[PDB]
Amino acid sequence: GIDPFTVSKGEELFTGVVPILVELDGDVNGHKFSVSGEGEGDATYGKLTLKFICTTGKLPVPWPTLVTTLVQCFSRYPDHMKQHDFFKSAMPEGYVQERTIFFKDDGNYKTRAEVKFEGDTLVNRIELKGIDFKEDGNILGHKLEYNYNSHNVYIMADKQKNGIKVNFKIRHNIEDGSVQLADHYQQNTPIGDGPVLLPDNHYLSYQSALSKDPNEKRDHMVLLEFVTAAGITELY
Numbered sequence: 001g002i003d004p005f006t007v008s009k010g011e012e013l014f015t016g017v018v019p020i021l022v023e024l025d026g027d028v029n030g031h032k033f034s035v036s037g038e039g040e041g042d043a044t045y046g047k048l049t050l051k052f053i054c055t056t057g058k059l060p061v062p063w064p065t066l067v068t069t070l071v072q073c074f075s076r077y078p079d080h081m082k083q084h085d086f087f088k089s090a091m092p093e094g095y096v097q098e099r100t101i102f103f104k105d106d107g108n109y110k111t112r113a114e115v116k117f118e119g120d121t122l123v124n125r126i127e128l129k130g131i132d133f134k135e136d137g138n139i140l141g142h143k144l145e146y147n148y149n150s151h152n153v154y155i156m157a158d159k160q161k162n163g164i165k166v167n168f169k170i171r172h173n174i175e176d177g178s179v180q181l182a183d184h185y186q187q188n189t190p191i192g193d194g195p196v197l198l199p200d201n202h203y204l205s206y207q208s209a210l211s212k213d214p215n216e217k218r219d220h221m222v223l224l225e226f227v228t229a230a231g232i233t234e235l236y
């Protein structure tokens with residue numbers, strides 16, 4: 001395992017503001033692209049502030065479709081739920097997060113990411129592969145609104161892999177007023193061989209706001225997000 005002498009482990013690494021670096025390499029129907037992101041996370045408040053840039057030119061998919069792929073260790077876990085925080089418990093060695101995201105009546109993304117500390121920086125390194133998309137559909141045809149809605153993300157233990165399974169749905173807004181469903185199937189597994197916290201069933205409550213940097217001429221996304229764990233509740 002880790003050196004114990006190690007000063008901070010698991011949740012101890014998140015008591016303050018932590019710098020975040022995100023790196024994504026993607027290929028959707030052979031459209032290749034890369035995204036980098038930077039900012040900070042303050043788990044005490046469940047607060048994420050991040051700016052992402054497409055480093056290869058124009059992003060060939062809508063930015064909103066990448067939000068879930070682009071650090072659940074920054075969730076605010078209530079003190080009364082702290083024993084259910086898998087994500088921080090896996091740190092600093094980290095965890096692998098894998099998803100399949102099914103876009104209804106369109107293609108799918110498959111993603112694999114490793115989330116771990118490199119010194120003081122929490123790093124999310126991702127590979128994304130998309131296939132079976134319609135060239136003129138809502139994704140490759142860029143028919144989605146640049147916005148986001150609030151969601152619950154449902155977490156349960158996966159004892160076989162010493163990890164968790166996560167499931168949720170995102171409904172992106174199409175420019176004609178309709179909805180593009182993106183059904184998310186997710187699993188996380190620790191990278192290290194030490195103990196992790198395997199949670200009871202619960203959820204994370206997300207709020208997300210997308211904006212633009214008026215001084216940024218590259219294709220980019222500014223993201224402000226708040227994340228709180230809930231769903232496990234006589235004192236009063």
Ligand SMILES: [Cl-]
Pocket residue numbers: 061062063064146
């Ligand atoms: Cl976009």
Ligand SMILES: [Cl-]
Pocket residue numbers: 071072073074227
């Ligand atoms: Cl997150």
Ligand SMILES: [Cl-]
Pocket residue numbers: 146147148149208209210211
């Ligand atoms: Cl928004």
